[PDB]
Amino acid sequence: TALVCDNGSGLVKAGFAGDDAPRAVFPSIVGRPRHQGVMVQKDSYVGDEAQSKRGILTLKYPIEHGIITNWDDMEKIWHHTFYNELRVAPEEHPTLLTEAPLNPKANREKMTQIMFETFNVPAMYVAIQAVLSLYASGRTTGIVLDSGDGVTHNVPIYEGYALPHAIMRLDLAGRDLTDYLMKILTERGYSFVTTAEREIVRDIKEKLCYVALDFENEMATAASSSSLEKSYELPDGQVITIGNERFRCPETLFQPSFIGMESAGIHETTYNSIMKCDIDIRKDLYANNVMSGGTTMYPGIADRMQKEITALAPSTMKIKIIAPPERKYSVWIGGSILASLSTFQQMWITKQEYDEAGPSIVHRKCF
Amino acid sequence: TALVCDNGSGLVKAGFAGDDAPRAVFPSIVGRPRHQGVMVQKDSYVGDEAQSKRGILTLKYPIEHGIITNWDDMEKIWHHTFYNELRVAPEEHPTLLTEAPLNPKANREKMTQIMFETFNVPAMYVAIQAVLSLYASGRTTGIVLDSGDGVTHNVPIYEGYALPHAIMRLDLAGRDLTDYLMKILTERGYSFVTTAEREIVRDIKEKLCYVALDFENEMATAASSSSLEKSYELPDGQVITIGNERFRCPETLFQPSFIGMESAGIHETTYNSIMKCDIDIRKDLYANNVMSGGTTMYPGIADRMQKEITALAPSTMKIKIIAPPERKYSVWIGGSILASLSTFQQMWITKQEYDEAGPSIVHRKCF
Amino acid sequence: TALVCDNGSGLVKAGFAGDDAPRAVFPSIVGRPRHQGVMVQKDSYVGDEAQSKRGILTLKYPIEHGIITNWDDMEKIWHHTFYNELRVAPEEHPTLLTEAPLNPKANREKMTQIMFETFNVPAMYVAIQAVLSLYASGRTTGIVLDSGDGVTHNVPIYEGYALPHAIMRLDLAGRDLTDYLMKILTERGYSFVTTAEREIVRDIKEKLCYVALDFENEMATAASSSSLEKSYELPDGQVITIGNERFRCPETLFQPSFIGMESAGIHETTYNSIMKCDIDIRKDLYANNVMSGGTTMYPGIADRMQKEITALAPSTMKIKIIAPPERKYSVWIGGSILASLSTFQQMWITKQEYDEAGPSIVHRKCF
Amino acid sequence: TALVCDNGSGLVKAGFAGDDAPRAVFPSIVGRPRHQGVMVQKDSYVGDEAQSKRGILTLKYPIEHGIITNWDDMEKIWHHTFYNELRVAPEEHPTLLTEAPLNPKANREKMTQIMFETFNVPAMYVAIQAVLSLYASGRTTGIVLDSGDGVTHNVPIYEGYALPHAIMRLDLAGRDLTDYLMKILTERGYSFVTTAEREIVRDIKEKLCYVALDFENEMATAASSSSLEKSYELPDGQVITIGNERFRCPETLFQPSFIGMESAGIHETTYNSIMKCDIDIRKDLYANNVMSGGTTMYPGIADRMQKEITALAPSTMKIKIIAPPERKYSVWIGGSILASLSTFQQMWITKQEYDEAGPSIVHRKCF
Amino acid sequence: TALVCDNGSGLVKAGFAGDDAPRAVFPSIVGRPRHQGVMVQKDSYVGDEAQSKRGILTLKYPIEHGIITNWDDMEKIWHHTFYNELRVAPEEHPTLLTEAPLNPKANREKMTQIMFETFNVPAMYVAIQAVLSLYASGRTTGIVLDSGDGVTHNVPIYEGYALPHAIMRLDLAGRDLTDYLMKILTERGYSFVTTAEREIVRDIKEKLCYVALDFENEMATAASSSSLEKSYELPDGQVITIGNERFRCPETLFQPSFIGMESAGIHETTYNSIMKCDIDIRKDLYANNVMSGGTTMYPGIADRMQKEITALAPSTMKIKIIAPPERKYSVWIGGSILASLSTFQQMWITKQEYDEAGPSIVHRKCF
Numbered sequence A, B, C, D, E: 001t002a003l004v005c006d007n008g009s010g011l012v013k014a015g016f017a018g019d020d021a022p023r024a025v026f027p028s029i030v031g032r033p034r035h036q037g038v039m040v041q042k043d044s045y046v047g048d049e050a051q052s053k054r055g056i057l058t059l060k061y062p063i064e065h066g067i068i069t070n071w072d073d074m075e076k077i078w079h080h081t082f083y084n085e086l087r088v089a090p091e092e093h094p095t096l097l098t099e100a101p102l103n104p105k106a107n108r109e110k111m112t113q114i115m116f117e118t119f120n121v122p123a124m125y126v127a128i129q130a131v132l133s134l135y136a137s138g139r140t141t142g143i144v145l146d147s148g149d150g151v152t153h154n155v156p157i158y159e160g161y162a163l164p165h166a167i168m169r170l171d172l173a174g175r176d177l178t179d180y181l182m183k184i185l186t187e188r189g190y191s192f193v194t195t196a197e198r199e200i201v202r203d204i205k206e207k208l209c210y211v212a213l214d215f216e217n218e219m220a221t222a223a224s225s226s227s228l229e230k231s232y233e234l235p236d237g238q239v240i241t242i243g244n245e246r247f248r249c250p251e252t253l254f255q256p257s258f259i260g261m262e263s264a265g266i267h268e269t270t271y272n273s274i275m276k277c278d279i280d281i282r283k284d285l286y287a288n289n290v291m292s293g294g295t296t297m298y299p300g301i302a303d304r305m306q307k308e309i310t311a312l313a314p315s316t317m318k319i320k321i322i323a324p325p326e327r328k329y330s331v332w333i334g335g336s337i338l339a340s341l342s343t344f345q346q347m348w349i350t351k352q353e354y355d356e357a358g359p360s361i362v363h364r365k366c367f
């Protein structure tokens, strides 16, 4: 049986191929103590253990914007995933890994070298995350908008063919929305500065933030009453109240200039990706907008995407956003489907063909 | 029962002798994927299946200007015709094939070798397309103007005798008009460049183009108003509007200098063919101008031919253009009539006389 | 009842003795297809059927200058005459045939062998054409000038006696005038070259040509105006105009040097024939010039003959040209009179006396 | 000194009387630009200048079948001949022109009117081309077969007397052979359609075509091997190979039915011309068959003519074909001899006698 | 004196006719501030001023693929060109403008309306860019391959005549190569996303990119060593190193499938354009391949074009690429030559004839 490990910038989703949900879901964090130990305590903490002790830790994400920046810490996370969360021996399970498109080549080359030389897996494979999301939805045609913690990317696929020249990638996702919410919470006098407090702000975002259908009408509503204001209790019992910050934070996805980015919002990027595709496949792409990832879980985002793309596309086109309730795990679920296919068993990169080609084998066997 | 297969440059018309319409009509195209397959898809697509997936295919016509240029792809089309469209075993049906006059000898020699050695037909026959059009009209006398996708040819026939020295052939037909319409659509800012977009332009032509009775008066009318402008919705919902391009594209048939050809238009070519015939048969040829093929289906082309030839011929001659409503299938219908005649059953090239003479038997048994 | 068949070089005149006009008059031509048959058509065409399809035929005259040169084709014409035009069984009708004087002996010997062994006539007879013309006019004395398509001959007859030493024969008649008109029509740019176009020129001659009373005064008139120019519409609607060719073509009869012949014109030949006769019969011959045949049908030819012979003969002689309006059929009409005479019923060559003497019986029973 | 200008359908041969070769030989063509001029180029090009720029020109022959059909273009060619090729003033040189026999009268009438009123020559003369060929050979007796680009004609001459009734003319010559070679080159897939490509085909003919001694034995040889196949490099570097087309194209001269003509071949036409002559001159005509013109330059044509006429003539007659190596210029060389004769200086049509008679003077002073 | 303004998709080249180099060369960009102004700054920046402040601007090209898409911004660029770079009054200088072939009609109609109604020029003219390149090389014959920032086009010209049916246009040029280099620089971890960073990538391309003579041998060389790797210092002092990206970016010109285009490379397009021309001009076109524009400035592109076309053309043809060192300004230099010709002074569209015909005068006076 194969292991499916979706290493996001934010969460690790790991499990066994054939299952319908990841067995292990924990934050992709390494924490190290930043204070003085006085009682006669590990040197670092991974995952949920780092989250429960974050008050005395400095928390580091080894993956930023889909790119592994700390390889020593990433190896701690993979080690924790295999031996503590799944409790398997990696040397007997083929491992399917995931990646964002348009990543640096050295990223998946080092993932291959570590899987084969540190964990000694028998076979591995690196899939593109948006492609796995289309497996999860049971489709062969559609434009996938995957947005997690690090990357937002669009991959148009038609009858199982990717249009790589139409792939869009935007380094604006959940972690940038968390940083923006931290910044605009200072307007109400709430100061979150440490890495542990950034975890509190992320939890505020996941519970209170939503996408306004019309942003300017929502700003006028929040300015005329308090029907939109909600409260949130902090870990120490302090209660904070937020109003228009609830929809200003997700609005950055549609207006990246809020955080100083020049790029277009996710609706324009989806439309630009479709318009780069051949005219004869555009109608099928308009009807099959698949959303996946945690950053697509905001209340009202599919209705907003529907409205924004409808305004860009021709009036005769039927725009349909496919936002399944389980789309937070679509990449893992699709990787579980793929790794269980009998047609896929020839696609693995085995340890034998890695020894005769080195880590560059991953560039000619994986899309 | 015999198979009648009219292999045009543009369409395959195939069916059974005795019927009144082809059973299978599909585009004579082979499509191959030009993008990267990512989901775990055939290697090539033929006919209507290539048309429905043309967004991700590069489309190739194996026949250009009546001449088969890709014999591997032509065999895919014949295989698709026999086994998928008609669903017959070719080894038990005599097969009537069609050809344009003044084709290279090797073209019908290779058609014979493939019918007898790849499909193992019991008997076959290659007829001239314009002759079959005269069978379809129930005549034995007339000058046939057949214009399809590849070839425009004139064959004068009198009392069942062809005048081969008066046969005219012009490599200017539907596909050259499609290419010209693509070129003049750039004047309005519409860019069609790929082979899939050429299929869209062909559909625009078949719906909006017509033959002006007086070209220069029509150009002045289109320049003074918008009564001639029509709209067309593209596959992706974009609406394009065209005005004088509607009649400028078919005008190339009467003025081949629009596409840089030195030859005369179809009206002068018809007249030159009649003037090469003996003076005593010209009056019967003037009264029996038979038009066939898809390129004669433009609205107003028989009225324009009538007016153009009347101006070339003597004033006492009665010019009559026979343009039946079913003339798009005249070659197939005439081949269906011919293959059902009891007098024709001695004309087949049987497998026995092919084995004692080789593929060159086709040159002494078929006109 | 007897059959009367006048086989001219140009026309067949056939009918029944006792009638006053031939029942069947058709061209003495055999046509064979010279093009490629493509529709699934006889091997040869005779008579009026060859004339209506002459555009695709090569036309052959089996009789040239009164002499049958193609015996297979002549038998097709006789077969067509008996079974298709007259619709009789030749084996029950005595057949009167005609011939020009001074023909080869083998010509009428083969006519006898074919009538008795191919058509099995009960009796036959070969008459001289000029003698039959004198029966048609009701005379027993006169010099007959018979001119058809092949031969012009003079036969002086006095009180029912022929003067055979005074018989003149000139191989210059209608077909040579047609060939000359074809040649001089090239002066105006009209090109008639094929055998079908020779039939068109013959029709021009029969409608527009006439005999000038004074040739040199007519040439000066045609050169000073256009009062003599006439138009003629060709079968394909082209209109041709001819001026002095109208009387230059018949002038060859009076000046055979126009076509390179050394012989004298028909007026000198008539006079030379009379001057070979005995002096005591010349006065009756001068008063009884009988003209017959199609080549004597030109407007103005009797007036020209009258003027030419008057200038040759003594001033005291009364020259009279007998040119009846029906003289185109005089040979047939006279043969109809002869074959109906009760005195002629002993003159037939019966099948019984042909079996005991062979085909040479015709030389001792027919003049 | 006199100018000798032989205006063929294909080439202009011009020079000075007394010389032994034409000074100017160039194609009788007028070219006009058929494309759009973009750089800031004459309106028409004549002769060799039209040949070097034929890629962007439409080429017109003003003479077709010996008859000048475009008088404006013919005047450009004469103007180019006098002022650019010979560089003379025509108003001081008597000009000998040539013509085919049996041409329209208006052709040489307009040549006379243009020479006297446009170029103001002092005197001119129109000779028959075949007669000049007999001057070139130094004979007074012989039957001349002249075949150029437009006309094939036979003129029998005996002791300086022409037999005009025996003159044959056939509108089948070099240009019809070029058109036929273009047609049968399509059997191998070579398409020559434009007027510039017709010039390429003419060059192929002049280098590769020959006359087979026995046509049917040559067809069997070409079908059993490749010893007859030759290659030819096109102007753009493409190499074409032709086999039996090399002798099928000249075979049309002996079998005009290849191009749909009903007439007899040049061997039968030569024999028919001799048989129209008086019996006492035929033996001298059989021994003096003079061939001239470019269409008699095929390798093997004199041997084929010798064999064909020997089979038609009586076995006791000595058939001799006189085919000199310089017979391509025989008409010009003979016209140079004639215009230099002291006996010819009374034969010119002077400007004085043209003013008192008009252009019709040419019909009573020139044969 | 005339103004010559070559408005490319990338650069403005402007100057005075008669000069040998453009006086003003600046980027065809409009920049607008995208940040918040805090110090108490224009609303937009044009040209080199937009390039020096691009850190705080969003940069827009008003011309895309040779077509002006933002007419307000294009008018800012023309205004900046006249009044700030050249420092002239446009109302006293005739202005020669340039355009790519096969542009929309409305593009040059709006250029004419703006020149006459906004800048009030006395006269103007719109030339085709490839034609001006042939003026710059001093030729009248040649096939021009012009490739700038927006368009690659081929125009074959022979003796000053364009063959418009053989004009090829490909919307793949410098800006598409810059976008592709941006995409493949992500393989090494370099992220350029903003419009200002696209200007940095364009500068990398112009300094480090070259055309490999053999692409697959170059890919093997770059994979076996580091002899091809070069460094580049970014504006902020960061040093980037690139290896095979140096020749993969220009390889898109020969393999447009790298960016998902179905079209053929520039070598096949040049050959297809020549093969659409008449066979008699192809040899002169093969010897006169003129390259112009900034996208032909890659090291090794003429050697690669020479090798690619040699492999397509017949072995006997002499392929010669004319790539002058100043070909980056060939369109301007040729327009300077043209606007100085005395023959061109009648070709201007004057303000007088614009008032009587409207902006559509440009379609009947300019090619």
Ligand SMILES: Nc1ncnc2c1ncn2[C@@H]1O[C@H](COP(=O)(O)OP(=O)(O)O)[C@@H](O)[C@H]1O
Pocket: A007, A008, A009, A010, A011, A012, A147, A148, A149, A150, A151, A173, A174, A175, A202, A205, A206, A207, A292, A293, A294, A295, A296, A297, A298, A299, A328
């Ligand atoms: N209900 C929610 N509403 C808004 N954002 C959410 C929600 N749940 C998760 N997220 C955000 O999704 C991001 C990552 O989710 P995931 O799809 O697992 O991405 P990754 O694969 O990068 O770990 C996190 O930044 C988190 O804040």
Ligand SMILES: Nc1ncnc2c1ncn2[C@@H]1O[C@H](COP(=O)(O)OP(=O)(O)O)[C@@H](O)[C@H]1O
Pocket: B007, B008, B009, B010, B011, B012, B147, B148, B149, B150, B151, B173, B174, B175, B202, B205, B206, B207, B292, B293, B294, B295, B296, B297, B298, B299, B328
């Ligand atoms: N209604 C129409 N108007 C104009 N053109 C048409 C129409 N229908 C078909 N055609 C053209 O006819 C051409 C071929 O038709 P067809 O007679 O089947 O030719 P072929 O035998 O070469 O396939 C195509 O190029 C198509 O564009």
Ligand SMILES: Nc1ncnc2c1ncn2[C@@H]1O[C@H](COP(=O)(O)OP(=O)(O)O)[C@@H](O)[C@H]1O
Pocket: C007, C008, C009, C010, C011, C012, C147, C148, C149, C150, C151, C173, C174, C175, C202, C205, C206, C207, C292, C293, C294, C295, C296, C297, C298, C299, C328
């Ligand atoms: N009206 C006419 N004028 C002049 N020639 C005529 C006329 N009618 C017939 N002919 C000519 O008479 C010739 C033969 O007529 P006919 O007396 O029947 O001769 P034959 O007996 O040889 O057939 C033909 O060549 C025809 O051209």
Ligand SMILES: Nc1ncnc2c1ncn2[C@@H]1O[C@H](COP(=O)(O)OP(=O)(O)O)[C@@H](O)[C@H]1O
Pocket: D007, D008, D009, D010, D011, D012, D147, D148, D149, D150, D151, D173, D174, D175, D202, D205, D206, D207, D292, D293, D294, D295, D296, D297, D298, D299, D328
């Ligand atoms: N060597 C050759 N072999 C065959 N044909 C030739 C040759 N040379 C010339 N011709 C043909 O001769 C024809 C005309 O030659 P020429 O005698 O000058 O005729 P004209 O007088 O009509 O110009 C041309 O059609 C040319 O193709």
Ligand SMILES: Nc1ncnc2c1ncn2[C@@H]1O[C@H](COP(=O)(O)OP(=O)(O)O)[C@@H](O)[C@H]1O
Pocket: E007, E008, E009, E010, E011, E012, E147, E148, E149, E150, E151, E173, E174, E175, E202, E205, E206, E207, E292, E293, E294, E295, E296, E297, E298, E299, E328
């Ligand atoms: N040395 C060089 N190497 C490669 N590309 C270049 C070079 N110089 C300029 N270019 C490219 O040429 C393109 C435009 O140049 P130019 O010929 O001025 O085109 P335009 O007329 O469209 O402005 C730009 O995209 C630029 O990147």
Ligand SMILES: [Mg+2]
Pocket: A007, A008, A009, A129, A147, A148, A149, A293, A331
């Ligand atoms: Mg993810």
Ligand SMILES: [Mg+2]
Pocket: B007, B008, B009, B129, B147, B148, B149, B293, B331
């Ligand atoms: Mg067809």
Ligand SMILES: [Mg+2]
Pocket: C007, C008, C009, C129, C147, C148, C149, C293, C331
């Ligand atoms: Mg008669």
Ligand SMILES: [Mg+2]
Pocket: D007, D008, D009, D129, D147, D148, D149, D293, D331
């Ligand atoms: Mg000649």
Ligand SMILES: [Mg+2]
Pocket: E007, E008, E009, E129, E147, E148, E149, E293, E331
């Ligand atoms: Mg440019």
